[PDB]
Design an enzyme around this catalytic site. Structure first.
Site, PDB file in Angstrom:
ATOM      1  CB  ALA A 239       3.024  -5.984 -20.950  1.00 19.25           C
ATOM      2  CB  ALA A 240       4.378 -10.980 -23.571  1.00 21.85           C
TER       3      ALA A 240
ATOM      4  NE  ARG B 256       0.567 -16.572  -8.748  1.00 23.19           N
ATOM      5  CZ  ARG B 256       1.864 -16.510  -9.055  1.00 23.19           C
ATOM      6  NH1 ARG B 256       2.375 -17.295 -10.013  1.00 23.19           N
ATOM      7  NH2 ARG B 256       2.645 -15.671  -8.379  1.00 23.19           N
TER       8      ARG B 256
ATOM      9  CD  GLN C   7       7.538 -13.150 -25.311  1.00 23.02           C
ATOM     10  OE1 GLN C   7       6.799 -12.657 -24.451  1.00 23.02           O
ATOM     11  NE2 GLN C   7       8.609 -13.891 -25.002  1.00 23.02           N
TER      12      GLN C   7
ATOM     13  N   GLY D 294      10.625 -16.447 -22.418  1.00 22.35           N
ATOM     14  CA  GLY D 294      11.549 -15.760 -21.527  1.00 22.35           C
ATOM     15  C   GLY D 294      11.787 -14.289 -21.872  1.00 22.35           C
TER      16      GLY D 294
ATOM     17  CG  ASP E  68       4.346  -7.397 -14.028  1.00 20.29           C
ATOM     18  OD1 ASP E  68       5.476  -6.841 -14.084  1.00 20.29           O
ATOM     19  OD2 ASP E  68       4.214  -8.652 -14.064  1.00 20.29           O
TER      20      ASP E  68
ATOM     21  CD  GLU F  37      17.145 -15.002 -13.538  1.00 19.87           C
ATOM     22  OE1 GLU F  37      15.945 -15.065 -13.194  1.00 19.87           O
ATOM     23  OE2 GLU F  37      17.819 -13.944 -13.485  1.00 19.87           O
TER      24      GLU F  37
ATOM     25  CB  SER G 189     -42.868  23.183  -1.410  1.00 18.58           C
ATOM     26  OG  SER G 189     -44.137  23.015  -0.910  1.00 18.58           O
TER      27      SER G 189
HETATM   28  C1  LIG Z   1     -40.118  23.818   2.621  1.00 19.90           C
HETATM   29  C2  LIG Z   1     -40.180  24.938   1.600  1.00 19.90           C
HETATM   30  O1  LIG Z   1     -39.677  24.785   0.393  1.00 19.90           O
HETATM   31  S1  LIG Z   1     -40.895  26.520   2.061  1.00 19.90           S
HETATM   32  C3  LIG Z   1     -40.633  27.528   0.491  1.00 19.90           C
HETATM   33  C4  LIG Z   1     -41.657  27.379  -0.629  1.00 19.90           C
HETATM   34  N1  LIG Z   1     -43.015  27.946  -0.173  1.00 19.90           N
HETATM   35  C5  LIG Z   1     -44.250  27.440  -0.488  1.00 19.90           C
HETATM   36  O2  LIG Z   1     -44.488  26.421  -1.192  1.00 19.90           O
HETATM   37  C6  LIG Z   1     -45.428  28.345   0.122  1.00 19.90           C
HETATM   38  C7  LIG Z   1     -46.132  29.117  -0.994  1.00 19.90           C
HETATM   39  N2  LIG Z   1     -47.402  29.752  -0.651  1.00 19.90           N
HETATM   40  C8  LIG Z   1     -48.554  29.408  -1.207  1.00 19.90           C
HETATM   41  O3  LIG Z   1     -48.671  28.518  -2.081  1.00 19.90           O
HETATM   42  C9  LIG Z   1     -49.754  30.228  -0.719  1.00 19.90           C
HETATM   43  O4  LIG Z   1     -50.926  29.416  -0.588  1.00 19.90           O
HETATM   44  C10 LIG Z   1     -50.054  31.440  -1.632  1.00 19.90           C
HETATM   45  C11 LIG Z   1     -48.760  32.273  -1.883  1.00 19.90           C
HETATM   46  C12 LIG Z   1     -50.532  30.977  -3.011  1.00 19.90           C
HETATM   47  C13 LIG Z   1     -51.154  32.259  -0.909  1.00 19.90           C
HETATM   48  O5  LIG Z   1     -50.603  33.445  -0.267  1.00 19.90           O
HETATM   49  P1  LIG Z   1     -51.454  33.949   0.945  1.00 19.90           P
HETATM   50  O6  LIG Z   1     -50.816  35.081   1.634  1.00 19.90           O
HETATM   51  O7  LIG Z   1     -51.846  32.928   1.974  1.00 19.90           O
HETATM   52  O8  LIG Z   1     -52.779  34.435   0.129  1.00 19.90           O
HETATM   53  P2  LIG Z   1     -54.284  33.944   0.141  1.00 19.90           P
HETATM   54  O9  LIG Z   1     -54.524  32.626  -0.544  1.00 19.90           O
HETATM   55  O10 LIG Z   1     -54.858  33.844   1.526  1.00 19.90           O
HETATM   56  O11 LIG Z   1     -54.960  35.157  -0.704  1.00 19.90           O
HETATM   57  C14 LIG Z   1     -56.219  34.934  -1.381  1.00 19.90           C
HETATM   58  C15 LIG Z   1     -56.069  35.134  -2.891  1.00 19.90           C
HETATM   59  O12 LIG Z   1     -55.594  33.906  -3.526  1.00 19.90           O
HETATM   60  C16 LIG Z   1     -56.518  33.490  -4.496  1.00 19.90           C
HETATM   61  N3  LIG Z   1     -56.722  32.053  -4.477  1.00 19.90           N
HETATM   62  C17 LIG Z   1     -56.815  31.134  -3.459  1.00 19.90           C
HETATM   63  N4  LIG Z   1     -57.050  29.878  -3.976  1.00 19.90           N
HETATM   64  C18 LIG Z   1     -57.090  30.065  -5.396  1.00 19.90           C
HETATM   65  C19 LIG Z   1     -57.314  29.201  -6.563  1.00 19.90           C
HETATM   66  N5  LIG Z   1     -57.527  27.889  -6.486  1.00 19.90           N
HETATM   67  N6  LIG Z   1     -57.287  29.769  -7.816  1.00 19.90           N
HETATM   68  C20 LIG Z   1     -57.072  31.134  -7.938  1.00 19.90           C
HETATM   69  N7  LIG Z   1     -56.862  32.012  -6.977  1.00 19.90           N
HETATM   70  C21 LIG Z   1     -56.904  31.415  -5.707  1.00 19.90           C
HETATM   71  C22 LIG Z   1     -57.843  34.265  -4.237  1.00 19.90           C
HETATM   72  O13 LIG Z   1     -58.620  34.474  -5.454  1.00 19.90           O
HETATM   73  C23 LIG Z   1     -57.350  35.589  -3.632  1.00 19.90           C
HETATM   74  O14 LIG Z   1     -57.056  36.636  -4.620  1.00 19.90           O
HETATM   75  P3  LIG Z   1     -56.786  38.183  -4.198  1.00 19.90           P
HETATM   76  O15 LIG Z   1     -55.344  38.354  -3.816  1.00 19.90           O
HETATM   77  O16 LIG Z   1     -57.098  39.097  -5.347  1.00 19.90           O
HETATM   78  O17 LIG Z   1     -57.644  38.570  -3.026  1.00 19.90           O
HETATM   79  C1  LIG Z   2      15.476 -14.267 -16.639  1.00 22.53           C
HETATM   80  C2  LIG Z   2      15.020 -12.965 -16.034  1.00 22.53           C
HETATM   81  O1  LIG Z   2      14.712 -12.013 -16.762  1.00 22.53           O
HETATM   82  N1  LIG Z   2      15.005 -12.958 -14.697  1.00 22.53           N
HETATM   83  C3  LIG Z   2      14.536 -11.803 -13.917  1.00 22.53           C
HETATM   84  C4  LIG Z   2      12.987 -11.772 -13.853  1.00 22.53           C
HETATM   85  O2  LIG Z   2      12.507 -13.012 -13.309  1.00 22.53           O
HETATM   86  P1  LIG Z   2      11.350 -13.756 -14.058  1.00 22.53           P
HETATM   87  O3  LIG Z   2      11.715 -13.975 -15.469  1.00 22.53           O
HETATM   88  O4  LIG Z   2      11.123 -15.000 -13.256  1.00 22.53           O
HETATM   89  O5  LIG Z   2      10.097 -12.887 -13.917  1.00 22.53           O
HETATM   90  P2  LIG Z   2       8.772 -12.889 -14.562  1.00 22.53           P
HETATM   91  O6  LIG Z   2       8.346 -14.261 -15.131  1.00 22.53           O
HETATM   92  O7  LIG Z   2       7.781 -12.332 -13.633  1.00 22.53           O
HETATM   93  O8  LIG Z   2       8.907 -11.948 -15.806  1.00 22.53           O
HETATM   94  C5  LIG Z   2       9.294 -10.562 -15.706  1.00 22.53           C
HETATM   95  C6  LIG Z   2       8.465  -9.597 -16.617  1.00 22.53           C
HETATM   96  O9  LIG Z   2       8.685 -10.036 -17.948  1.00 22.53           O
HETATM   97  C7  LIG Z   2       7.489 -10.374 -18.608  1.00 22.53           C
HETATM   98  N2  LIG Z   2       7.725 -11.498 -19.529  1.00 22.53           N
HETATM   99  C8  LIG Z   2       8.448 -12.710 -19.079  1.00 22.53           C
HETATM  100  C9  LIG Z   2       8.671 -13.735 -19.951  1.00 22.53           C
HETATM  101  C10 LIG Z   2       8.179 -13.613 -21.351  1.00 22.53           C
HETATM  102  O10 LIG Z   2       8.356 -14.527 -22.158  1.00 22.53           O
HETATM  103  N3  LIG Z   2       7.532 -12.467 -21.693  1.00 22.53           N
HETATM  104  C11 LIG Z   2       7.282 -11.403 -20.840  1.00 22.53           C
HETATM  105  O11 LIG Z   2       6.689 -10.432 -21.283  1.00 22.53           O
HETATM  106  C12 LIG Z   2       6.441 -10.597 -17.498  1.00 22.53           C
HETATM  107  O12 LIG Z   2       5.135 -10.310 -18.026  1.00 22.53           O
HETATM  108  C13 LIG Z   2       6.940  -9.648 -16.360  1.00 22.53           C
HETATM  109  O13 LIG Z   2       6.419  -8.314 -16.555  1.00 22.53           O
HETATM  110  O14 LIG Z   2      12.535 -10.693 -13.055  1.00 22.53           O
HETATM  111  C14 LIG Z   2      13.013 -10.741 -11.688  1.00 22.53           C
HETATM  112  C15 LIG Z   2      12.419  -9.519 -10.979  1.00 22.53           C
HETATM  113  O15 LIG Z   2      11.027  -9.723 -10.904  1.00 22.53           O
HETATM  114  C16 LIG Z   2      14.591 -10.712 -11.695  1.00 22.53           C
HETATM  115  O16 LIG Z   2      15.070 -10.818 -10.348  1.00 22.53           O
HETATM  116  C17 LIG Z   2      15.085 -11.894 -12.488  1.00 22.53           C
HETATM  117  O17 LIG Z   2      16.520 -11.884 -12.589  1.00 22.53           O
END
Ligand SMILES: CC(=O)SCCNC(=O)CCNC(=O)[C@H](O)C(C)(C)COP(=O)(O)OP(=O)(O)OC[C@H]1O[C@@H](n2cnc3c(N)ncnc32)[C@H](O)[C@@H]1OP(=O)(O)O
Ligand SMILES: CC(=O)N[C@H]1[C@@H](OP(=O)(O)OP(=O)(O)OC[C@H]2O[C@@H](n3ccc(=O)[nH]c3=O)[C@H](O)[C@@H]2O)O[C@H](CO)[C@@H](O)[C@@H]1O
Ligand SMILES: CC(=O)SCCNC(=O)CCNC(=O)[C@H](O)C(C)(C)COP(=O)(O)OP(=O)(O)OC[C@H]1O[C@@H](n2cnc3c(N)ncnc32)[C@H](O)[C@@H]1OP(=O)(O)O
Ligand SMILES: CC(=O)SCCNC(=O)CCNC(=O)[C@H](O)C(C)(C)COP(=O)(O)OP(=O)(O)OC[C@H]1O[C@@H](n2cnc3c(N)ncnc32)[C@H](O)[C@@H]1OP(=O)(O)O
Ligand SMILES: CC(=O)N[C@H]1[C@@H](OP(=O)(O)OP(=O)(O)OC[C@H]2O[C@@H](n3ccc(=O)[nH]c3=O)[C@H](O)[C@@H]2O)O[C@H](CO)[C@@H](O)[C@@H]1O
Ligand SMILES: CC(=O)N[C@H]1[C@@H](OP(=O)(O)OP(=O)(O)OC[C@H]2O[C@@H](n3ccc(=O)[nH]c3=O)[C@H](O)[C@@H]2O)O[C@H](CO)[C@@H](O)[C@@H]1O
Ligand SMILES: [Mg+2]
Ligand SMILES: [Mg+2]
EC number: 2.7.7.23
Lengths: 449, 449, 449
Positions: C9-10, C15, C73, C78, C102, C151, C402
């Protein structure tokens, strides 16, 4: 005249390494055997006889065509034995076309040519000349006429030189078929019952066999392993892509386009690289689809532009909508004219009205949003409470400040404004500002950890 | 010596199913006819005569090269008739090179060889030998010298055996051209005026015609439908990809790389699969581009790493920036040295300073952000109030807590900290903590629905 | 018997336009020279001698196989001169196999056939017949026996007609090698020391040289520029894809699949287009991978479904997990059975329990989340304070509203509910509702700017 089809699908797909019956593996999003069934029906089959050996439960779950007559072949004693299991169901006055369940690309056009070549009281045979006929039935001829088929194993070295081989597909009258099938013997190299022996049997009766060839070899290729399935998948995608291009659809790279279902389209549609179309999709005129999009069971109106890496399923977009890149529309997503959905926005069972916009980092689920609405970045409709889903309603002309949480069920009246960072738990009046904000305060000289 | 080019683009592109004139359909992001025009100018054309029949408004909107002389050909009575429409504009002392507007890959190198082969007072002709010459003009020779061209329709069966055909491209002195063009008659199979008749006319005058061939058949292929356009698109992308690889750019899969514009680059650039480069892009040394990225009209500095599925347009990245995956940079996005943008982050007209980071679920629009800044997940610059856009300024060393909303216009002083969940409506002092938080409280034994 | 390998591999990779030594450029995620080293060890090499000329620091950093003997090398005089530098280290009683650094695709099967063909006291040579042998060493024979190598530069026109050429690979006893190497002279066209001269030297001693051929030409192709590297990359990916398909893995498009490491798998795995597998990946039965996914150093359990455009690295998914589309799992991400991660969700050093869900626009970092948990959209675990990272703990059965910010370190007790829009700075009791909400208020007739 009348014609029924018999599909032999009772062989064992060992080299698949699968727990799913071979003929159920998909090609372009459809079971290989379903491709064959569609061909049969498309050709005009009155009845389609499906001969299977196992996986019957899975097959019956996947296949539900009305005119399917399920025929069991418990032991796989050869194609001849398989046909004998279906024979009792053939009508004496109909043609019987035999197809393989693992040869998915057979074209109706070729089958139709085969039907037309079948002589009265004779047999229509589908053959092909291969460079290497190894492993296939060899067609023998006398003065140019087909007189029989000799299986590779039973064929002498000289006979193995014959390059015209049996594709396996053939057609003949049902009464004639029953007559010949009854005379099959298993005294051959494989020790099986060869359906291919009916060719010599017909010739012996003075009936003629006429051979026709397929348009392409891919049409008659069978699938025994995943690599072969893969190749046919590419052929299918390539031909579909080519038809679409010839039909006026611009594909930026036909080798990087996949269609797995049906694509209806208007004029000047442009589809970039790596787009995948699934189920039934309709595209209006001038729809532009950016790279990597996946679109399934959706409707896309005129002039829509779907930006890169957007996923769409069961969605409906009116004209002039723009979505993406990185947008994700789920079932029920509906956009009205001119609506806009930007990056990292998800919609599910939600409607966005005319000219309405949801440009970023947003979730809209179970919502109805009016026209001329602006949904700020970070807005979330909290449609789920952990047991039920609720609706969010937003009237026209509403401006929703960013990072707003709307706790459904709730309604935002027309013309309202929702301050940034608001948690909306109650209906908002029309033309009113809803807010739930702590005034900003400040602590001097704060030292971070 | 002096040379002008004539591009015939007045034929009808029926099999395109388009409302856009055929020659305007793009190949590598540029109108097919623009490829031809670029070739003409690149060869040294003083004037480029464009012969069109319709879609003139669209053509004029799309094509705006200064040295374009628009020539109308109302009725398409043949290539000969088309050239007659441009002839009055040819200079008696310049060479006239004829090209087709729907043969986009013609190379300047081949045209230059053609110019060089043209004999004094004669004609340089571009021909090619095809396996199946069906449908093309046949080159006739006498003692090895080209003496004329016979169109397929007018050619006898024996003449149709000639495999050397006319590509359509030719060059000759302008005065000579006018002389021959005046003598064209439409007494032939097509009943049109054949530009190809000038070959026999020149030979008859004792002038010599010399034929040269293209490097590749793709160079002279014409486009009549989308499938053909598609194939040339692949050829073009393949050749460009190959040049880039030979120039030292590593493409992980040259068949899955698209360049639609210009790519300037340093050493050791690595580009993974399905990357698309549009407009004018500059890449510094060691830039690494992950799979599926789309980069348009942007500048990318040394050692940047663009992770998978990132979209970039009109952006400027200094050295050592890392963005993505799933990042989206829009016009005006600027990153200073070492900056970082993570997943689901969008930037528009925004600058992120040295070593600054916006790792997730963030929107930065119309903002100037200092150095050593940390933007927490969920942060949003509220740059729009529904009518106007406003600026957000963040000084150096600022730490922005997650889910912060910054209501522009606003300025956050250097060294400040913004508590998580803050809504920032007013300027924040330097080294101060801004906050707007409701203390966390709790309700015991809460039962969800 | 005993055998050591010498890798030359020397040579200089001009290119390549690179600051990285040529043999260090990767193919399938591994240095070209590492492919050769793996082949040597896989064949049974006791010692692997690596002959290099420069970039030694970089080579030593990249290559760390225990049985590597580094041989310098300094001047590239060669292949013969290169072997002389390693010769002193050959054991008199072991076979010495010479390979190129290669020529990355050489197969162990072919090398093994070469070893077997080597005659006692003779030389095993690897040759190939090319349509155009230009530039390669020509094999000369006498009565069918190999007698030497000439060659290209030293060969006469008639000798250049020989189509059987030297691949460069050969094997011989170490003591014999030393004997012949000492007699090399540089009196030839190149003025170098040809390792190829040992063939004639052995024949002259009465020793026999036997030639064997590779299975494929790709096996012996050398890489001098990026375009050639590119082609071998495709060949490698194509063969790997084909083996996987034959092994029962369904690739929707084998031409659009890249494997850069090791893939362990169960039955019925389906992998859609443009998926990239890196490092060591394990996939259980029935894993389905949607288009464009990138999966690295990860474990994926039975029945998982990875939706489109998902990026995964150093993650562990139990059975039946569903993630994506647009999900991003980073190191340490762990999902327990049935867990779900939706779009625009990022996880880092975080565990999501059984049946737990994080469906959207979420960041989970440095967290332990219990079973049956629902993380609402917009939730963020604030794991970083600008200097340290802290843990977030969420017990089972928790419902997180959410847009919740969890300021770590913090613990949410089992069965708790967190109201939407909450900032959680303190532990939340079990079965309690945590909240920090400003009641919604309203301002009538608000006029936007
Ligand atoms: C796309 C998706 O990911 S969908 C999946 C995820 N889902 C969501 O994010 C939806 C979640 N739901 C909520 O956040 C709702 O508003 C909930 C769950 C909090 C409310 O539930 P609801 O059935 O509507 O209850 P609601 O608010 O009307 O009930 C009133 C109560 O909340 C309380 N409340 C309302 N606002 C507040 C507040 N800021 N602080 C404290 N309590 C509060 C009231 O005190 C009351 O208490 P109580 O249960 O003792 O009576
Ligand atoms: C003299 C010889 O061997 N000829 C062969 C060589 O051609 P040729 O010698 O022309 O081929 P390359 O120059 O590509 O060398 C072949 C391989 O040897 C390595 N390398 C070469 C020279 C060096 O000093 N050090 C080194 O490490 C290259 O990195 C390559 O991996 O390969 C061809 C296939 O591809 C064969 O058909 C040729 O008969
Ligand atoms: C990336 C994107 O998506 S950008 C698009 C989405 N845009 C946004 O999220 C930005 C939305 N803008 C906001 O949230 C603003 O803070 C607004 C609209 C609420 C304020 O508008 P401004 O022009 O700045 O008005 P400003 O706050 O200075 O006016 C003061 C008024 O607000 C009221 N106000 C301020 N804080 C509160 C509070 N906590 N509770 C009640 N009223 C309050 C005052 O009582 C006062 O009332 P008044 O009109 O009778 O005098
Ligand atoms: C995924 C990611 O992006 S991670 C990166 C981004 N990181 C974040 O978002 C995390 C940011 N951290 C926070 O928001 C924290 O809650 C901080 C920085 C505000 C609190 O820091 P802590 O070390 O926990 O301080 P803690 O709250 O316990 O200190 C109490 C102080 O805060 C004040 N405080 C608490 N709540 C309030 C309030 N509502 N209003 C005013 N002051 C308050 C107290 O008055 C007290 O003041 P003092 O320092 O004079 O004693
Ligand atoms: C005797 C016979 O017919 N030979 C033909 C058969 O070969 P051959 O019989 O060897 O082919 P296969 O074993 O693949 O069987 C063909 C088809 O018949 C089905 N099958 C087979 C046996 C059975 O008992 N039940 C059953 O359903 C298979 O599932 C497959 O769909 O197809 C080849 C084309 O591929 C033809 O060139 C051969 O002339
Ligand atoms: C008579 C003539 O020239 N024959 C040549 C012409 O065939 P032919 O004339 O059949 O080819 P086309 O009809 O495609 O026309 C060639 C080009 O000329 C343009 N065009 C044609 C007619 C017209 O009235 N106006 C106009 O602008 C077309 O838009 C197209 O760009 O090209 C073939 C190569 O493709 C050559 O092998 C034929 O020898
Ligand atoms: Mg938020
Ligand atoms: Mg919030």
């Amino acid at each position: 005249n009348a014609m029924s089809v018999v599909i032999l699908a009772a062989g064992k797909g060992t080299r698949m390494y699968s727990d799913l019956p071979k003929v159920l593996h998909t090609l372009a999003g459809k079971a290989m055997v379903q491709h064959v069934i569609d061909a049969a029906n498309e050709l005009g089959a009155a009845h389609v006889h499906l001969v299977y050996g196992h996986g019957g439960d899975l097959l019956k779950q996947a296949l539900k065509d009305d005119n399917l007559n399920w025929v069991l072949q418990a032991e796989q004693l050869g194609t001849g034995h398989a046909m004998q299991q279906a024979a009792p169901f053939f009508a004496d006055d109909e043609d019987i076309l035999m197809l393989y369940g693992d040869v998915p690309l057979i074209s109706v056009e070729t089958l139709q040519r085969l039907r037309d070549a079948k002589p009265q009281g004779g047999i229509g045979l589908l053959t092909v000349k291969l460079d290497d006929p190894t492993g296939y039935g060899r067609i023998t001829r006398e003065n140019g006429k087909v007189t029989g088929i000799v299986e590779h194993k039973d064929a002498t070295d000289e006979q193995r030189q014959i390059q015209e081989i049996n594709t396996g597909i053939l057609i003949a009258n049902g009464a004639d078929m029953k007559r010949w099938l009854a005379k099959l013997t298993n005294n051959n190299a494989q020790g099986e019952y060869y359906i291919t022996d009916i060719i010599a049997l017909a010739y012996q009766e003075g009936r003629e066999i006429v051979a026709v060839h397929p348009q392409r070899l891919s049409e008659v290729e069978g699938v025994n392993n995943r690599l072969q399935l893969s190749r046919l998948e590419r052929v299918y995608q390539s031909e579909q892509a080519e038809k679409l291009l010839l039909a006026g659809v611009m594909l930026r790279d036909p080798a990087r386009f996949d269609l797995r279902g049906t694509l209806t389209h208007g004029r000047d549609v442009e589809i970039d690289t790596n787009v995948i179309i699934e189920g039934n999709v309709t595209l209006g005129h001038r729809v532009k689809i950016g790279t990597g999009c996946v679109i399934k069971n959706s409707v896309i109106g005129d002039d829509c532009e779907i930006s890169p890496y957007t996923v769409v399923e069961d969605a409906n977009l009116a004209a002039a909508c723009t979505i993406g890149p990185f947008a994700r529309l789920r079932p029920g997503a509906e956009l009205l004219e001119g609506a806009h959905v930007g990056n990292f926005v998800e919609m599910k069972k939600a409607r966005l009205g005319k000219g309405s916009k949801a440009g970023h980092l947003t979730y809209l689920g179970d919502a109805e949003i009016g026209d001329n609405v602006n949904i700020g970045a970070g807005t979330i409709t909290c449609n789920y409470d952990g047991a039920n889903k609720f609706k969010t309603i937003i009237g026209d002309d509403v401006f929703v400040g960013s990072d707003t949480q709307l706790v459904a069920p709730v309604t935002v009246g027309k013309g309202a404004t929702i301050a940034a960072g608001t948690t909306v738990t109650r209906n908002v009046g029309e033309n009113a500002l809803a807010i739930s904000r702590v005034p900003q305060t400040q602590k001097e000289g704060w030292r971070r950890p």
